[PDB]
Amino acid sequence: SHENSNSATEGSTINYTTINYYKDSYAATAGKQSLKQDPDKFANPVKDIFTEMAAPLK
Amino acid sequence: SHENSNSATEGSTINYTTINYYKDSYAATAGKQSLKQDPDKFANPVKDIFTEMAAPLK
Amino acid sequence: GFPTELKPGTNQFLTTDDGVSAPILPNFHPTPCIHIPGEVRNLLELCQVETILEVNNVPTNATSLMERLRFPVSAQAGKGELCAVFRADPGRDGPWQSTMLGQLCGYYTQWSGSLEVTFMFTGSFMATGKMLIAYTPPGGPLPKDRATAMLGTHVIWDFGLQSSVTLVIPWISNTHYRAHARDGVFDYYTTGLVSIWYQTNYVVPIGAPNTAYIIALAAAQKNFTMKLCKDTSHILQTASIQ
Amino acid sequence: GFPTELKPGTNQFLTTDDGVSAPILPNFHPTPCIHIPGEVRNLLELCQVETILEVNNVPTNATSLMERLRFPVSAQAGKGELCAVFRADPGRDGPWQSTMLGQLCGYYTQWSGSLEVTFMFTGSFMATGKMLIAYTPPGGPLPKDRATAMLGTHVIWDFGLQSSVTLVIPWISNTHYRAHARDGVFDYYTTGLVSIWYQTNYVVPIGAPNTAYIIALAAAQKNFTMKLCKDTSHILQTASIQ
Amino acid sequence: GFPTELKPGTNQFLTTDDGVSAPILPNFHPTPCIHIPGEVRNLLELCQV
Amino acid sequence: ATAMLGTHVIWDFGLQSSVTLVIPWISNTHYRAHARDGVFDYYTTGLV
Amino acid sequence: GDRVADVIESSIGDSVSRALTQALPAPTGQNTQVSSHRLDTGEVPALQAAEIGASSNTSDESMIETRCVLNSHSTAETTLDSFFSRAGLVGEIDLPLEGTTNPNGYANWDIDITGYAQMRRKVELFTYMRFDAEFTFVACTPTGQVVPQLLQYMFVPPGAPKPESRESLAWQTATNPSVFVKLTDPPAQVSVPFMSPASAYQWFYDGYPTFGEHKQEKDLEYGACPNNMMGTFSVRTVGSSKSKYPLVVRIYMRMKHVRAWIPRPMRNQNYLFKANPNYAGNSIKPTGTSRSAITTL
Amino acid sequence: LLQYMFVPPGAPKPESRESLAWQTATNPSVFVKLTDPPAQVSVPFMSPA
Amino acid sequence: EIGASSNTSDESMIETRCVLNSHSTAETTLDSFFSRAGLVGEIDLPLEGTTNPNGYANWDIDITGYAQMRRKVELFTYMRFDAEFTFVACTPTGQVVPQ
Amino acid sequence: SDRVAQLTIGNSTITTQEAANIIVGYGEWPSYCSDDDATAVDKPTRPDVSVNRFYTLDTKLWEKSSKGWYWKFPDVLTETGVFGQNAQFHYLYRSGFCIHVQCNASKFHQGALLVAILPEYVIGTVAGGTGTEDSHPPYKQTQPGADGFELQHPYVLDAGIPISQLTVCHHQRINLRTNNCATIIVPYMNTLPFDSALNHCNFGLLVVPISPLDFDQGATPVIPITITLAPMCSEFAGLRQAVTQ
Numbered sequence A, B: 001s002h003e004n005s006n007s008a009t010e011g012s013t014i015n016y017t018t019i020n021y022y023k024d025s026y027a028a029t030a031g032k033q034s035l036k037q038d039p040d041k042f043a044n045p046v047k048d049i050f051t052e053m054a055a056p057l058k
Numbered sequence C, D: 001g002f003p004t005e006l007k008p009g010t011n012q013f014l015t016t017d018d019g020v021s022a023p024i025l026p027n028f029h030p031t032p033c034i035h036i037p038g039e040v041r042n043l044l045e046l047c048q049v050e051t052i053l054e055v056n057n058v059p060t061n062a063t064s065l066m067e068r069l070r071f072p073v074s075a076q077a078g079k080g081e082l083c084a085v086f087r088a089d090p091g092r093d094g095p096w097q098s099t100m101l102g103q104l105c106g107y108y109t110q111w112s113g114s115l116e117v118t119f120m121f122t123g124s125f126m127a128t129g130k131m132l133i134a135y136t137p138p139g140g141p142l143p144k145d146r147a148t149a150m151l152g153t154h155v156i157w158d159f160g161l162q163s164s165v166t167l168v169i170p171w172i173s174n175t176h177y178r179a180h181a182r183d184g185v186f187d188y189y190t191t192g193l194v195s196i197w198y199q200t201n202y203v204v205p206i207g208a209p210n211t212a213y214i215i216a217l218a219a220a221q222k223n224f225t226m227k228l229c230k231d232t233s234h235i236l237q238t239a240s241i242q
Numbered sequence E: 001g002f003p004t005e006l007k008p009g010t011n012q013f014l015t016t017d018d019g020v021s022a023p024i025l026p027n028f029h030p031t032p033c034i035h036i037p038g039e040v041r042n043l044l045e046l047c048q049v
Numbered sequence F: 001a002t003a004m005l006g007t008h009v010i011w012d013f014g015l016q017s018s019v020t021l022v023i024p025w026i027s028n029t030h031y032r033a034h035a036r037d038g039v040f041d042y043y044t045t046g047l048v
Numbered sequence G: 001g002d003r004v005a006d007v008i009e010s011s012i013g014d015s016v017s018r019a020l021t022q023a024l025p026a027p028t029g030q031n032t033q034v035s036s037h038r039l040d041t042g043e044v045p046a047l048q049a050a051e052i053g054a055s056s057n058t059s060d061e062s063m064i065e066t067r068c069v070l071n072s073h074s075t076a077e078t079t080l081d082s083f084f085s086r087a088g089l090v091g092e093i094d095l096p097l098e099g100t101t102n103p104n105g106y107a108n109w110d111i112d113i114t115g116y117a118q119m120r121r122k123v124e125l126f127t128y129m130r131f132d133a134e135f136t137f138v139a140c141t142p143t144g145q146v147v148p149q150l151l152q153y154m155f156v157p158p159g160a161p162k163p164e165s166r167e168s169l170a171w172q173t174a175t176n177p178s179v180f181v182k183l184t185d186p187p188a189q190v191s192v193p194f195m196s197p198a199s200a201y202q203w204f205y206d207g208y209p210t211f212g213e214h215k216q217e218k219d220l221e222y223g224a225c226p227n228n229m230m231g232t233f234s235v236r237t238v239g240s241s242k243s244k245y246p247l248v249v250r251i252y253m254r255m256k257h258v259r260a261w262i263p264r265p266m267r268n269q270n271y272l273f274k275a276n277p278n279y280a281g282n283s284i285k286p287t288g289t290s291r292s293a294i295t296t297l
Numbered sequence H: 001l002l003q004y005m006f007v008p009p010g011a012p013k014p015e016s017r018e019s020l021a022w023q024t025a026t027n028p029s030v031f032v033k034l035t036d037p038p039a040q041v042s043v044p045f046m047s048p049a
Numbered sequence I: 001e002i003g004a005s006s007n008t009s010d011e012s013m014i015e016t017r018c019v020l021n022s023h024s025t026a027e028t029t030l031d032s033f034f035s036r037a038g039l040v041g042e043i044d045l046p047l048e049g050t051t052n053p054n055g056y057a058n059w060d061i062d063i064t065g066y067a068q069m070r071r072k073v074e075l076f077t078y079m080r081f082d083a084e085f086t087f088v089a090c091t092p093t094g095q096v097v098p099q
Numbered sequence J: 001s002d003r004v005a006q007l008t009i010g011n012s013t014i015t016t017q018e019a020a021n022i023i024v025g026y027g028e029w030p031s032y033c034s035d036d037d038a039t040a041v042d043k044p045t046r047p048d049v050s051v052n053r054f055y056t057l058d059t060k061l062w063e064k065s066s067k068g069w070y071w072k073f074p075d076v077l078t079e080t081g082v083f084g085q086n087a088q089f090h091y092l093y094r095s096g097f098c099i100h101v102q103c104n105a106s107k108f109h110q111g112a113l114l115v116a117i118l119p120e121y122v123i124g125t126v127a128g129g130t131g132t133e134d135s136h137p138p139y140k141q142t143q144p145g146a147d148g149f150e151l152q153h154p155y156v157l158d159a160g161i162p163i164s165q166l167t168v169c170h171h172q173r174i175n176l177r178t179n180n181c182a183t184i185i186v187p188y189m190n191t192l193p194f195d196s197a198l199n200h201c202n203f204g205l206l207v208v209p210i211s212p213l214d215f216d217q218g219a220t221p222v223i224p225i226t227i228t229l230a231p232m233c234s235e236f237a238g239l240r241q242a243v244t245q
C-alpha cells in the first residue's frame, strides 16, 4: 500500500499491524500494540540499584 | 489495470499513485503529488546569477 | 454492479467498534514528537508504585481529614492486643479506595496476582517494638486473640535501622481471576483480612514521646493482571454542571 | 450475495473526502497540454517573492491611499529618535495584511520558519544616513530609547551605492509551529516587534530635498512551512451579490 | 466508490446464518481453559449409553 | 540569601565531625602580598 | 580546533538521554519459581527503606514457600489503546424552535473534551496526551424521534470568521471541512488528526499565556493553554426559512494511536467548571467510606 | 432512536433516563434506530472461571 | 532595483545552530489546497412565484457566483482541473421530501 | 557506603551523613536538546558553572500544627544570582533541576515529611465555599515567589487531587528516625523544547507533614526546613531588554 506516513506514532519502537483504505495514515484502525513494559521507571528510579537479597542502608 | 490514459496530468514529470475503478483516468482520486519545488523561477529570474557572498553592483 | 448482501449488524453504532473512518484533512503531516520523559506503555506500570492506604478511616470532618493516613500505636498492658484491621479487597469501599491500585482497578472488573502492603514506622529512634501482621484467607472471621490469628500467613516485624516491612499478600484463590466483592452474593470474591497485633509492646525511654504512628503503603506485584474494562463505581457526580 | 456489513460513516457527505466518483463522459480524451510558462508546483513559491509592506497605515481617505506604502525620514535633533514600528505577525490585522505572505497565510492556521523584511531607500544620491533596525523577541514592550532597543537582534544599515538591507527575522520560538495571534488568550503566539531607529541622522547637502522615503518589502525564507488549511479571516462580503 | 449492487436477501435476520459480527471488547484475552474430565465432542456419544 | 551566591559548603553533623572548606585561589595575579589598610586593599582575599 | 584542556576534556553539550531503564518485552505475567525454607543470616528480602522513595522489590518466593506456576495471563488489556478507544460523550448541542438559547437555527460549540465528568476523569489521569480521534454525531429530537431533516456540521479552525446567523456567507465552506448528513441514515463519523502546534496536548497548564501586570481583571486567563484551543464546531439547519423540528446533537470521541506522558493523581472531588480545577470549599468529601472504629469492621 | 448499554458487574446502574451513567465513557454501547436491520454484537467468554 | 528577491541565508546574518528540520511541505501543494468542495451555485424551484413557477430552472455553468470560491481560483490566471460536482437538494426549511 | 553522600556541582557542595539515596526523575538525566528536538535557529547560550550551583532559598518553621508549603519552579529563581538575571533578559529557557530538602532533628523527635514533585501543579480555589462563584487565585498565590505559600486544605492539595496518591510522581520521605534529607533530580518535563521562564512554571514542589511532629518539654521547640536546589544543563535563547514580569 503506497500511502503517506503521518500517523501519531511514527518514530517509535512500537510496530503496528493495521488496515487502511485511504492515503493518510491517521485514518487507520488502532491495531495491535507491542507489549513492552518498563517497571524500572516509576517503581525503582534510584541511581545505585541494590539487590533484593541485601539490606540497602548499612 | 487496463484502462484509458486521459487524465489532466498525462505528459508531466509528476508521478502519481491513485486508485481507479473505471475505464477512464479522470475519475480517479487525487493521490500523492511529487514534491518538486522551483524557487528560482519567481524569486531569482535574472540572467547572470550572482553569489550571495558578493555585492552585485560593483 | 458487484453482487453483495447486507447482513444484520448494519447501520448500528457500536461505541467500541474499531474500523477505518473518513479523514477530513488530506496530505496532512502532524507536529513531530520530541523526547518527553515519563512515557507510559501500559497501565500495569502505575500498579507497582506504593501509595498511602487509608487504614484509619474513622474521622469525618474537614479539619481532621489529614488524620486518615496513619494509625496510632502506644504502650499497652502487654496482653497481645489488637491495633488495626482492614479488608484486603482492592475493589471495595474501604482503605484501598485511595490508592493508585484502587482507582485503576475501579476501571476494571476482574483482577489477578499478588498484592503487597508496605508499612513504615514514623516514631522515635530510641523507641523499639515488634508487631505481628497477620493475613487471614477467607472463611475465617475476625479473630478474638493473637493466638487465633497466628495460624494464617503472618510476618513478625521488628523496629530498628530499617523502618519498613513488606507483607506480600499471596494469591490464595480458587479462580484465575476474582471480581470486586460487595454485600450479598458477591462475598464469594472476598480476599480476606489483614490484622496488626502487638507482638511484644512499644517500649520507649524517658524524654521520647508516648504515641507513635505507622503509615501503610500498598502496591502491586509483577504478576498483577486486570481484565474486562468497565466504568468506575466508587464515584458519583452532581447534576447541572455549571 | 457477498456477506457485508454497513458501518457508520454511511450516507454522509464529507466535503474533503477523496474518492472515486462516477464519470459522465466515456472514452473521452481531453485537449493536450502545451508549454505555458510560469507553472507553479507549490504555494511556497509565492512566499519567497518580496511585496510591499504597508508600514505607514495612518491615512484613511481614498485620495491618499497611495501614501500607505512608504514612511518618511528627515533631519532630526540627533538624539537617536524613532522612525516607525510595527508587529511581526503575518496573521494579524496590520502591515503584513497586504503582502503575498499575508494572504497566503490567511488560508492556513499555523506557520513556521524565518521571515525577512527587505527595505529600500528612495532618496537622493548625495544624501546619506544610517538606521538601526531592531527586532524584539516577545515579552519586551515598546522601548523608550534606542539604548533599550539595541539589546535585541538588530542590523545597522548604511546608505550608499547599494540601497537595500535584509533584516531576516529569526525563528525564535518555543513551539514548532505558531498560529495567528490576536487579542486575548492568543497573545501566546505573538512574534514580537520591529522598530526603526535613527542611528546617526539623515544628512543632506544644499539643493537636494529635505524629506526622503523608505519602502519596506517582506518575504519568506527557504525554511517556511504552513499547515492546517482553513478559511480566510481578514475579509468579509456584503449580502445580496447582484 | 467501488461499484456494487445489493441483491435480495438484504436486511434480513436469519437465525441460523453463520457470519462475522462486531466484537465489543478489543484486545480481550479470556480465561485459560483447564483439564475438566468428561469433554463431549459429539452428541452420538450420549446415544451409546 | 545574599551570602549563598559565593563559594559555600553545607555541612551536616553526624558520625564524621569535620568538614574542609578549601578556599580556592581566585586571583588576578600569580602571587598576592599581605593586605592592610590603605592602598594595600588590592591584595585582599575575601571573607569566610 | 580546540587547544584548551578544560573544554576538550569537558562534558558540555551532552545531548543523548542517559537512561537508567531499558524496556523489556513482557507478553504475559511473570511466573513463580520453587522456593524452600531459608533460615540464614544477613540476607533479608523483607526489610526495606521507604525513605529511599523506591517501591518494594520483594518477590513472592522470598517470603513464603511457593509452587511453580506457569502463568499465562495476558497483559494486552491494560495498554493505552485498549483503555482509551471507547467513545464517550464529550458534548451536546441544542437547537430549539422558540426560546432564548439558540432561537436562530444555529449553535456554535467550542472544542473541549472537559465538559462531561465521565470522560474528563479518564483523560486527566495523565498530563500530556497525543492522539487521533473518531468523532461521531448522533442527531435526534428531544423525544428521541428521527425526523427527515438535513444538517450541516462545520469545523471552524482557530482564526476563521464565525457565522453570525444561518444565512451568513461563512457557511459556503470553500476550505473548511464540512459534513452534510440527514437524520434518516447512520450517524456521521470523521477522523481528526493530531492538530496541535505543540508536540502533545496538555490538560493542566500552570501559568499565564500573556505578559504584563496581571491584576483582578485579567485573572481568568490562568490555565488557558492556547495549544489546545482547536476552534469552533458549528451546526445549522440547511435552508433559508424557519424549520419546524427541534434538534439535539451528541458528540462521541474515541482516541486512537494514543501516547501518554507523566501520570498524575486522579481527581476525587466533584467537578465544578470547564478547564478549571475548582472544588467545593465547605463540602470536602473523603475518598473512602467511614466506619465506627479501627479495631472492628 | 434507542441505546443499548452493557453494564458490567460493579458499575453504577442508571437511576433514570437523564442520569449521568448513560455517557458510556468505557461501557460498550450500541446506538440503533428502528428503521434499520437489528443490531448484532459478539460477546466473548467473560467468566472468571 | 534588480527585481530579484533576497537570497540572504539565516547563517550569514546571525550565529545559528544546527537544526535537522523535518517539517513536511506536503500541505501547501496545489492538490492539497483546491480539493475542498465549496458552494458554486444555487438553483431555486418554488411553487407560486415569478422566479421559476414552471417547475424547471436553467443555470449557466460558472464558478464565479459566490465570493468564497471565486477568490481562491482567481489567485491564478490559467487553471486545468477535473471536477467532482455534488448536488444536495432540500426544501427551503431543510426538510427532505420524497421527490 | 550508602548513608553518606556529597553533591558537587559548580562552586557549591552539599555534604550529608544521614542521606537515604539520590533518586533520579523518571530514569532520565538532564541533558541538552538535540538537533532533532530543536526549533529555534539562533545559537543558545549556556553558562557552565555560573548557573549550575546550589541556591539556598528560605527557612520554614515546622511547628506542631503545620499543614504544608509549595514552591513553583522556576519562579523561585528569578531574583537570585546570574540565573535570576539571565531569565529576565532571555526568552527561551531549558533546564533540569536538582532539589535537596534538609530537615534535621534529634533522636528524641519523631515525625515524617513528604517531598513531592508534581508537574504542572495547577492551583484551584474553593469557588466561594459553596461552589457558585467562578473565582480564580490571585497572582500572589499562583506564583508565590521564593517564600512559598501555606496550604489551606492539604488533604486535597488545594487542587482537587487527593494526597494519598501523590507518590505516583517523584517522592522521597524525610522521616526523622532514619534520614534527614531528601534529594531529587528532575529532568526537563515539557511538551516544547524551550519555554518562557516568566509565566510557565514547569512543576511544583510539595512538602507536606504526613506524620506530625512530637517532642517532650525540654527539647528545643523549633524545627526548620530549608530548600536547596541547583539547576542543571541550563540553556537560554533570544535576547531582549530586562522585563520583570
Ligand SMILES: CCCCCCCCCCCCC/C=C/[C@H](O)[C@H](N)CO
Binding pocket: C024, G111, G112, G113, G114, G133, G135, G153, G154, G155, G177, G178, G179, G190, G192, G195, G201, G202, G203, G228, G229, G230, G233, G275
Ligand atoms: C467536522 C469536524 C469535527 C470537529 C473536530 C474537532 C477536532 C479537535 C481535536 C479534538 C482533540 C481534543 C482537544 C483537547 C483539548 C481540551 O479541551 C483542552 N486541553 C482543555 O479545554
Ligand SMILES: CCCCCCCCCCCCC/C=C/[C@H](O)[C@H](N)CO
Binding pocket: D024, I061, I062, I063, I064, I083, I085
Ligand atoms: C450533470 C452534469 C453536471 C454539470 C457539469 C458541468 C461541467 C463544467 C465544468 C466546470 C469547470 C468550471 C468552469 C469554469 C468557468 C468559469 O465560470 C468562467 N471562466 C468564468 O465565468
